[PDB]
Structures are given as structure tokens and as C-alpha cells.
Amino acid sequence: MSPILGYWKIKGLVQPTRLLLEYLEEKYEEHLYERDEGDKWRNKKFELGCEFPNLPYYIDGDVKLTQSMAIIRYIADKHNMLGGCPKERAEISMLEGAVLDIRYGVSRIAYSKDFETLKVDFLSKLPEMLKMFEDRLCHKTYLNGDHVTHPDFMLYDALDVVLYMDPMCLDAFPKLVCFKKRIEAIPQIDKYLKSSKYIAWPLQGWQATFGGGD
Amino acid sequence: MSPILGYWKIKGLVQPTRLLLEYLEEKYEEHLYERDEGDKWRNKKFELGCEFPNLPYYIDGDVKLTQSMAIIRYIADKHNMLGGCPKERAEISMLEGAVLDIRYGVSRIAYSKDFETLKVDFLSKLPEMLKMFEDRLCHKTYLNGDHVTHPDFMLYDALDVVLYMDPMCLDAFPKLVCFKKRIEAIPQIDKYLKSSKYIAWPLQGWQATFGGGD
Numbered sequence: 001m002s003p004i005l006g007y008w009k010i011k012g013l014v015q016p017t018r019l020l021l022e023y024l025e026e027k028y029e030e031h032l033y034e035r036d037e038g039d040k041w042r043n044k045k046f047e048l049g050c051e052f053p054n055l056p057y058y059i060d061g062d063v064k065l066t067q068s069m070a071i072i073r074y075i076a077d078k079h080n081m082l083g084g085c086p087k088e089r090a091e092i093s094m095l096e097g098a099v100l101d102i103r104y105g106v107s108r109i110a111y112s113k114d115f116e117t118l119k120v121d122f123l124s125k126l127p128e129m130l131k132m133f134e135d136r137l138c139h140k141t142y143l144n145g146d147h148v149t150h151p152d153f154m155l156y157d158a159l160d161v162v163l164y165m166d167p168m169c170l171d172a173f174p175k176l177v178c179f180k181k182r183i184e185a186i187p188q189i190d191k192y193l194k195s196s197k198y199i200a201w202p203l204q205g206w207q208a209t210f211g212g213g214d
Numbered sequence: 215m216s217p218i219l220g221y222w223k224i225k226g227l228v229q230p231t232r233l234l235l236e237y238l239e240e241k242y243e244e245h246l247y248e249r250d251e252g253d254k255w256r257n258k259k260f261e262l263g264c265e266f267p268n269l270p271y272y273i274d275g276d277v278k279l280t281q282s283m284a285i286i287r288y289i290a291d292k293h294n295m296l297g298g299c300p301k302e303r304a305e306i307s308m309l310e311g312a313v314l315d316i317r318y319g320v321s322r323i324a325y326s327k328d329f330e331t332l333k334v335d336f337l338s339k340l341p342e343m344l345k346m347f348e349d350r351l352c353h354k355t356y357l358n359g360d361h362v363t364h365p366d367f368m369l370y371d372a373l374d375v376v377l378y379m380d381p382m383c384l385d386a387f388p389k390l391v392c393f394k395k396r397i398e399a400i401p402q403i404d405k406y407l408k409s410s411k412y413i414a415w416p417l418q419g420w421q422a423t424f425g426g427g428d
């Protein structure tokens with residue numbers, strides 16, 4: 001009747017998936033566990049039929065999927081966006097990993113006691129990572145060319161987050177600044193960000209030192 | 215003439231890829247950067263034609279690929295092992311992510327100053343992660359059934375590593391113990407592990423607190 005995307009009521013690992021779903025105008029319902037509902041999750045964790053119980057999870061009546069990256073790729077796969085041949089498929093997975101180096105680079109330091117200092121190390125190397133995408137966008141509208149692929153929403157999510165860590169990290173990366181605005185300009189995305197469904201905060205778990213809180 | 219797999223001369227991110235290549239009897243050469251060859255890497259980093267320069271990298275004359283997960287999937291993709299339909303494809307990516315939770319769980323704490331204490335937290339939750347694979351192997355020979363898929367070598371690599379962190383972590387997981395021995399029993403793998411090509415140590419960068427050193 002309608003696929004279900006379950007996760008904490010935060011951006012975290014699943015925000016890019018939500019954006020991809022909105023871009024595709026796919027119908028879905030959400031199981032959003034609030035910060036005071038850890039017990040609620042534990043009572044459902046093992047009764048969903050998931051072989052590798054975790055959050056996020058995506059139940060499609062066709063699959064009981066868990067890992068965030070498998071979920072985003074599945075939805076894109078349903079719409080035939082994963083590639084066309086091994087080379088394009090690898091190209092897209094390479095973009096995936098590259099964006100993850102940034103997004104995980106943030107999550108990895110979030111919630112540690114040393115976040116304030118680890119943040120300076122991450123930000124010192126952020127430019128080198130960002131530069132690769134800036135170059136990539138030199139002759140391509142989106143990461144994989146003229147057409148949107150899931151890594152575009154992944155990059156979008158990563159940019160949204162690092163801007164919170166350093167509001168100036170994109171100064172000097174005009175292509176990236178344009179890209180972020182282009183994604184927001186996509187009718188479906190524009191509508192979603194301005195909707196009741198948009199979860200603007202937190203970036204990480206509420207308990208995180210960075211991107212946490214209400 | 216022959217694809218190239220470049221990485222540090224350590225197991226790290228690329229060991230499962232090496233195993234997949236050996237299983238498939240694929241021909242390849244390796245660019246193995248020794249611990250005192252950081253300068254050598256920096257002099258090659260930007261002259262390989264890679265759009266997202268990094269280690270590992272895989273040059274096939276067909277592609278200039280970098281991200282470790284994109285590389286392993288590409289090689290499997292060349293041999294038509296990624297799936298068959300979106301559901302099987304997602305099944306395999308879910309297994310990927312699940313193994314990564316263990317492998318990255320280790321790399322994430324390796325090299326931190328607090329590794330000794332972080333190690334106890336990781337190991338306390340390791341059983342719950344391992345149990346999912348133990349259950350999975352209850353009615354399946356390999357992770358995806360009767361046939362080997364790349365996540366099997368990923369799981370193998372993860373098991374090899376956590377056993378160094380805790381030689382007893384698999385006691386109580388007989389299916390996992392059998393699985394590890396089954397992978398080692400694959401003729402191609404048996405031959406590889408006993409060969410000159412096998413890199414037994416280090417597990418992480420030589421400078422890591424865990425799995426480092428010569």
C-alpha cells in the first residue's frame with residue numbers, strides 16, 4: 001500500500017534518501033522515532049522482519065532493507081538510476097564514496113568529547129575534498145553530467161552540514177555554491193524544503209556535540 | 215595490458231578486493247606504497263588521471279577509479295556478481311554495509327589516543343553485530359546463498375581483524391568460525407594466503423595504535 005522509511009526524526013544518515021524520494025515523487029510514509037522514543041524503537045527493532053535490524057530501515061512489501069546506502073541505491077535502482085554499464089555504475093559509486101568521506105568525516109567526530117579540536121583537523125582537509133567536486137562541476141551540471149543521480153542529494157546533504165560547521169567553507173568554491181542552490185531550485189526539492197515534512201534539525205543524534213540538541 | 219590496484223602495502227581498505235580478484239583469477243599488478251614512501255604517493259597522486267585522487271585506486275584502461283567500495287563492486291560488476299534485480303542488488307549492498315559496520319568500527323577507533331578504552335565499547339557491541347551474520351549463515355552457505363559474492367570476502371576480512379582485537383570473539387559463533395575456514399578453503403584463496411603476494415600485516419596504517427607496526 002505504501003513503502004515505509006524508518007529512522008530517528010533527524011537528518012542524519014537518511015536525509016539524502018528523503019530528498020531522492022521527493023525528487024522522484026515516490027509515495028512513502030515515515031516511522032520517525034523522536035528523541036524520547038528509544039524504547040519504542042527497541043520494541044520494533046526485531047519485529048519488522050529485518051535480517052540486519054538497524055535504523056534507517058525501508059519496508060517496501062518487496063524488501064525489508066536496513067543499511068542507509070543500500071536503501072538509497074535501491075530506490076534509485078527502482079528508477080533505473082544506478083548506471084548502465086559497470087563503468088557508469090562505478091563512476092556513481094565513486095561519487096558516493098567521495099561524498100561520504102565528507103559526511104562521515106563529520107559524523108565520525110560528532111558526539112566525541114574532542115569534537116572542538118577534531119573539527120579543526122577535519123576543516124583543514126575539507127578544502128582538498130571540496131576541490132575535487134568543484135573541479136568535477138567545472139564541465140558537468142550535476143555530479144554525473146546533465147542528469148541528477150542520487151550522489152547529488154548526498155553532496156547536497158554534505159554541503160548543508162559542513163556549512164553549519166563553517167559558514168565560510170564554500171567561499172572560494174563558486175561552483176559548489178551554485179550547485180547547492182541548483183538542487184534547492186529543483187521544483188520537487190524546493191517544495192519539500194518549504195514543507196511540513198522537512199526536518200531542519202538536528203543534523204546528528206540529539207546527543208551529539210555537533211549538530212545535536214533540539 | 216593489465217589493470218593496476220594501488221594502495222599502501224597493508225591490508226586496510228583493500229584486502230577484500232585483493233581476495234575477490236584472486237577468487238576470480240583476474241590478472242592484476244599492484245602499486246604497493248611502503249611506509250617510507252609517502253613522498254612517492256604524493257608525486258603520483260595527481261598524475262594518474264583520477265578525478266577523485268585517493269588510495270586505493272584501480273586503473274583498468276577502462277576506468278581511473280578510486281573509492282575502495284566502488285572498486286570492489288566494479289570488479290564484481292565485471293563478472294556480473296552485483297545482483298540480478300533491484301532486490302538482490304539491495305540485498306548485497308545491505309550485507310556490504312553490515313560488514314562495514316564492523317570493519318569501520320575498528321578503523322574508526324584505530325590510531326585514536328583512546329583506542330584502548332574505545333576498544334572495550336566496540337567489543338561490547340560486536341556480539342550483536344556478529345549475531346546477525348551467524349543467523350544469516352544458519353540457512354545459507356555464504357552470505358547471499360549458495361554462491362560467493364564480494365561481501366563474503368568483506369566479512370572474511372572483518373573476522374580476520376576482530377580476531378586480533380579479541381581472539382575469543384568468535385567463540386559462541388560456530389557458523390562464523392566455519393565460514394572463516396570455508397573462505398580459506400576456497401582453492402584460489404588457500405593458494406593466495408600461502409603465497410608471496412599475501413600481506414599479513416599491518417591491518418591498518420603502520421602508525422595505528424591497533425593493527426599498526428611492522
Ligand SMILES: N[C@@H](CCC(=O)N[C@@H](CS)C(=O)NCC(=O)O)C(=O)O
Nearest residue numbers: 013054055056066067068069311315
Ligand atoms: N551503517 C548503518 C548504520 C546505522 C546506524 O548506525 N544507525 C543508528 C543511527 S545513525 C541507529 O541508532 N542504530 C540503531 C540500532 O543500532 O539499534 C547505516 O548506514 O544505516
Ligand SMILES: N[C@@H](CCC(=O)N[C@@H](CS)C(=O)NCC(=O)O)C(=O)O
Nearest residue numbers: 097101227268269270280281282283
Ligand atoms: N573512502 C575512501 C578513503 C580512502 C582513504 O582514506 N585512503 C587512505 C588510506 S586508508 C589514503 O592514505 N588516502 C591518501 C590521500 O588521501 O592522499 C575509500 O574507501 O577508498
